[PDB]
Amino acid sequence: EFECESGPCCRNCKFLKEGTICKRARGDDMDDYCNGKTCDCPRNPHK
């Protein structure tokens, strides 16, 4: 039927809009955001 996975950046087998915050950073860092492709909250590379 559908390719379905769950995680912070998915809801009911759909991907949350790219750029959606999924984990607020400590200090001055870039926040983690959903990529609109995968269900995990990707740990930002740029820190």
Author numbering: -1 to 45
Could you share sentences copied from the article?
Echistatin (Ech) is a short disintegrin isolated from Echis carinatus that contains 49 residues with 4 disulfide bonds. Ech is the most extensively characterized disintegrin and has a conserved RGD motif and a long C-terminal NPHKGPAT tail. Similar to the reported structures of other disintegrins, Ech has a well-defined core composed of a series of nonclassical turns crosslinked by disulfide bonds (C2-C11, C7-C32, C8-C37, and C20-C39). The RGD motif is located in a protruding loop that is formed by two antiparallel β-strands (residues 16–20 and 29–31).
The diffraction data of Ech were obtained to a resolution of 1.80 Å from a single frozen crystal, which contained two molecules per asymmetric unit. Superimposition of the backbones of chains A and B with an RMSD value of 0.226 Å demonstrated that their overall structures were very similar, except for the RGD loop and C-terminal loop. Structural analysis showed that the RGD loop of chain B was squeezed by residues K21, R41, and K45 in contact with sulfate ions and residue S4 of chain A through crystal packing. Therefore, the R and D side chains of the chain B structure interacted with each other and formed hydrogen bonds. In contrast to chain B, the R and D side chains in the RGD loop of chain A are far from each other. Furthermore, the backbones of the C-terminal GPAT residues of chain A showed a weaker electron density map. In contrast, the conformation of the C-terminal tail of Ech chain B was well defined, possibly because the C-terminal residue K45 can interact with the O atoms of SO42-. The structural analysis of Ech chains A and B showed that the side chain of the D30 residue in the RGD loop and the amide proton of the N42 residue in the C-terminus formed hydrogen bonds. Interestingly, the carboxyl group of residue M28 interacts with the side-chain Nζ proton of residue K45, and the side chain of residue D30 interacts with the side chain Nζ proton of residue K45, resulting in a unique turn structure for Ech. These results showed that the K45 residue stabilizes the conformation of Ech’s C-terminus and is important for its integrin recognition.
